[PDB]
Design an enzyme around this catalytic site. Structure first.
Site, mmCIF file in Angstrom:
data_model
loop_
_atom_site.group_PDB
_atom_site.id
_atom_site.type_symbol
_atom_site.label_atom_id
_atom_site.label_comp_id
_atom_site.label_asym_id
_atom_site.label_seq_id
_atom_site.Cartn_x
_atom_site.Cartn_y
_atom_site.Cartn_z
ATOM 1 C CG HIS A 62 1.299 -11.183 0.976
ATOM 2 N ND1 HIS A 62 1.402 -9.810 0.983
ATOM 3 C CD2 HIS A 62 0.585 -11.502 -0.137
ATOM 4 C CE1 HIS A 62 0.904 -9.316 -0.130
ATOM 5 N NE2 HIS A 62 0.381 -10.316 -0.824
ATOM 6 C CB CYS A 71 -0.895 -6.666 1.409
ATOM 7 S SG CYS A 71 -0.113 -7.497 2.778
#
Ligand code: CL
Ligand code: CL
Ligand code: CL
Ligand code: CL
Ligand code: CL
Ligand code: ZN
Lengths: 76, 260
Positions: free
Chosen positions: B216, B12
């Site tokens: 994240h 990510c």
């Protein structure tokens, strides 16, 4: 030995003398002790590259008067 | 709506940059003026080939995945030696992004802005004014009134170890694309108040990389209709349209101004 400058994103700069073949773990821990930071919360970058604690100045080919960049660790 | 990369091997930190890259109008203009053999040409062409597939069952999705993963893998392998990661490691776009830009000098020039750190201690006299040129600067502990035209933050003084002096970035020449990283996010999340003029050209926040749960990264894209596109690679290959901006102010990790 060799002289290194440790520059944080807050503008602080701390000088360190270190031997060319000692791993940077002792350097990292001492900078954390001066600035009151936690080793688990910061990252070191040199010449654009991340540095592990096992790394040595000779292995990363650091010269004298070089500068290490400190970042608060923000990964994912 | 638009297509995006799927999460795999904790990439990510790279997906968020790639999603940010393909929706920049200035970059798309630059890549189609250049004249082939570019990593950015391959990136945007493979992206549009995938987005046209989405515009049109399961067989279509594997082809999209193949087109996006092929160029993602090429970029990752190019970033790997300097960034020193093994596939599956977590990493940060603050580190990866400028190394990514250096892959093509004509593209990096779109991001290189010049500024000066202006400092003047109030307890003692220590003072400096230092010119720099960067593609991504990090701010931490910014003043609440922080604005690109008043880009100041709290910092210690190197002469007397006094805390709460202020170091201020004075923009001098802003590139067509202007990016900043915030360790603790922005003071507030109404992004229109962070728009600014510089020497006659308007700059608006066109995309933002959000840092959620300290684990994240997710990319938000401003579309023409005023809506937003959330590119959370965990939410699979398609993206999500939102009526208005949504990232918490403290999770605004990287901010991208454009519109030259
Ligand atoms: Cl720091
Ligand atoms: Cl490097
Ligand atoms: Cl490997
Ligand atoms: Cl000041
Ligand atoms: Cl708010
Ligand atoms: Zn001072």
């Amino acid at each position: 030995m060799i002289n290194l400058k440790v520059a944080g994103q807050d503008g602080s700069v701390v000088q360190f003398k270190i031997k060319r073949h000692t791993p940077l773990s002792k350097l990292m821990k001492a900078y954390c002790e001066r600035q009151g930071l936690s080793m688990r919360q910061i990252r070191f970058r040199f010449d654009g590259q991340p540095i592990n604690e096992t790394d040595t100045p000779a292995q990363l080919e650091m010269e004298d008067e070089d500068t290490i960049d400190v970042f608060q660790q923000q990964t994912g | 709506l638009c297509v995006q990369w799927k999460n795999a091997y904790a990439l990510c930190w790279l997906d968020c940059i790639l999603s940010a890259l393909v929706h920049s109008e200035e970059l798309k203009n630059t890549v189609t003026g250049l004249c082939e053999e570019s990593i950015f040409w391959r990136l945007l062409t493979k992206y549009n080939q995938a987005n046209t597939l989405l515009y049109t069952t399961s067989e279509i999705f594997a082809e999209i995945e193949t087109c996006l993963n092929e160029v993602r893998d090429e970029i990752f392998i190019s970033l790997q030696p300097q960034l020193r990661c093994t596939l599956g490691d977590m990493e940060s776009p603050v580190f990866a992004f400028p190394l990514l830009l250096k892959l093509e000098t004509h593209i990096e020039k779109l991001f290189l802005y010049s500024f000066s750190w202006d400092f003047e201690c109030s307890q003692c006299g220590h003072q400096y004014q230092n010119r720099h040129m960067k593609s991504l600067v990090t701010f931490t502990n910014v003043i609440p009134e922080w604005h690109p035209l008043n880009a100041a933050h709290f910092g210690p003084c190197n002469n007397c170890n006094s805390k709460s002096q202020i170091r201020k970035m004075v923009l001098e020449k802003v590139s067509p694309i202007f990016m900043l990283h915030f360790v603790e996010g922005l003071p507030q999340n109404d992004l229109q108040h962070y728009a600014f003029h510089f020497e006659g050209c308007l700059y608006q926040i066109t995309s933002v990389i959000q840092y959620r749960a300290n684990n994240h990264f997710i990319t938000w894209i401003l579309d023409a209709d005023g809506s937003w596109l959330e590119c959370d690679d965990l939410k699979g290959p398609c993206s999500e349209r939102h009526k208005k901006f949504e990232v918490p102010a403290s999770e605004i990790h990287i901010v991208i101004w454009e519109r030259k």
